[PDB]
Design a protein around this ligand. Sequence first.
Ligand code: A1A7P
Ligand code: BR
Length: 167
Amino acid sequence: VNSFSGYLKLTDNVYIKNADIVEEAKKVKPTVVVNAANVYLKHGGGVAGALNKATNNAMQVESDDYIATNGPLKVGGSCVLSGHNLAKHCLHVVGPNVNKGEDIQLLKSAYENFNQHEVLLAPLLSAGIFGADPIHSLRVCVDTVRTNVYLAVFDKNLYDKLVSSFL
Ligand SMILES: O=C1CCCN1Nc1ncncc1-c1ncccc1F
Ligand SMILES: [Br-]
């Protein structure tokens, strides 16, 4: 038993809610919140901008030190950093950004990072301003992640479309 509330059960291990991941994190304080990162950990907009804003830019400061030490992530890769006031840890995961022309096949690799954590609060990778088909992203999630994932989808119309079209 865990403390996530109001989620719809899609599969054995995947749950979904129409909610802002920031507000879900502030409520649950999960062990892991997933950020929809880019390879430079530049958290300007989308989910990343929203999470970073809710940390008062502490996420960005920490990320800048990470990049200065380690260099950029790979598309499809991840790193674990602090969750600041939102969660114990933040798993920064880089899905492919179709609006940058990146290879959507890397989306499966991106979701594989979730399997290193028993439970996660996550956004829909590569959707939104990353330009991929959100129905496809949800399909890849369900077919790749084996650990327990609570998906927060902020856009109400999208949430409704995702539930109604789920196979
Ligand atoms: O709705 C969707 C589908 C894909 C990404 N996305 N956005 C979010 N998803 C979960 N929580 C928060 C946001 C969010 N909220 C405010 C500003 C920006 C944001 F990205
Ligand atoms: Br977005």
